[PDB]
Design a binder for this molecule. Structure first.
Ligand SMILES: Nc1ncnc2c1ncn2[C@@H]1O[C@H](COP(=O)(O)OP(=O)(O)NP(=O)(O)O)[C@@H](O)[C@H]1O
Ligand SMILES: COc1ccc(NC(=O)C[C@@H]2SCCNC2=O)cc1
Ligand SMILES: [Mg+2]
Length: 299
């Protein structure tokens, strides 16, 4: 394989992992419904269901997301075309992609299977996620958002613990980002106050979503009940804060900068990458893989 990955930073460990995924992907061509065997259900959301599947032609295990959409065939085909951009999204911080296709009322998005599942699933078992682990998560989320914005001009639009996947090799990756404008049009809140009120999507809204997700994972509960009451709280009341004493001053300041109500005052990705919480977390030696495997009983 003639790898053209010099544009990415990539330490030797990241380089080996990404080249291994891309090498395995070469066994995968055209994806069809009849070529899959369902193993088990990984999870489900409001929009779709995700199954752990065996792709019989390649022998690969993958995560197949099925989204029910029975619309005009021409615009369903525009969605499928837009999803093909996922073949160009190669980053240590973005879930690997095998392909996307339509069959009998369902759009299938086939991904790299992440054996640690999502952070909302690990939060259920952990109770609370330690601050040092959240430092590594924050670096991965910032780096993933920077990659999508810089290389592909795409905003995530759905940052939350269920969209941050982890694995037994200690990798942390984003999934379910808004690669398809047409799929967005055809389809607890983590939405920013400005997005709830009606404001054009900005990178700043993803930063708010990350801030709120970090607070939830740190305290072990959604930090903000009726639907109007909850949204009114987000829009019209001060943002939540981490409890003092139990968390470092750097982590408190980091989440506070993500959760500033005014998006122009709220930190941007460049500012977050050089914040004391990130500089401290990047220097820390944390065995994320060991912590993950022990917390959820993975090997
Ligand atoms: N590639 C994957 N590997 C392993 N588990 C996965 C993968 N993709 C998704 N899952 C799991 O499937 C669950 C359900 O996903 P999903 O249907 O996207 O619901 P959601 O994340 O809660 N909502 P949304 O992303 O907004 O549609 C996730 O939260 C993960 O735990
Ligand atoms: C391969 O990496 C992925 C990239 C994007 C997607 N998801 C979508 O584009 C479908 C939408 S995005 C918001 C809520 N979830 C959805 O159903 C899945 C994996
Ligand atoms: Mg999801």
């Amino acid at each position: 394989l003639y790898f053209q990955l010099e544009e990415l930073e990539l330490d030797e460990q990241q380089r080996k992992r990404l080249e291994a995924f891309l090498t395995q992907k070469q066994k995968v061509g055209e994806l069809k419904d009849d070529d899959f065997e369902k193993i088990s259900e990984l999870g489900a959301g409001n929009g779709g269901v995700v199954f752990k599947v065996s792709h019989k032609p390649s022998g690969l295990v993958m995560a197949r997301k099925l989204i029910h959409l029975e619309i005009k065939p021409a615009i369903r085909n525009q969605i499928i075309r837009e999803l093909q951009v996922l073949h160009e999204c190669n980053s240590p911080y973005i879930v690997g992609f095998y392909g996307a296709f339509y069959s009998d009322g369902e759009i299938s998005i086939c991904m790299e299977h992440m054996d640690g599942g999502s952070l909302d699933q690990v939060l259920k078992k952990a109770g609370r996620i330690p601050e040092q682990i959240l430092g590594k998560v924050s670096i991965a989320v910032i780096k993933g958002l920077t990659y999508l914005r810089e290389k592909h001009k795409i905003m995530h639009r759905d940052v939350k613990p269920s969209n941050i996947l982890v694995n037994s090799r200690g990798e942390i990756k984003l999934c379910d980002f808004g690669v398809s404008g047409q799929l967005i049009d055809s389809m607890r809140s983590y939405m920013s106050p400005e997005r709830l009120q009606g404001t054009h999507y900005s990178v700043q809204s993803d930063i708010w979503s990350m801030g709120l997700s970090l607070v939830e994972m740190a305290v072990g509960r959604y930090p903000i009940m009726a639907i109007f009451e909850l949204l009114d709280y987000i829009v019209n009341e001060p943002p939540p804060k981490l409890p003092s004493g139990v968390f470092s001053l750097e982590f408190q300041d980091f989440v506070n900068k993500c959760l500033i109500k005014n998006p122009a005052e709220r930190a941007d990705l460049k500012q977050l990458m050089v914040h004391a919480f990130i500089k401290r977390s990047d220097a820390e030696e944390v065995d994320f893989a060991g912590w993950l495997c022990s917390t959820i009983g993975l090997n």
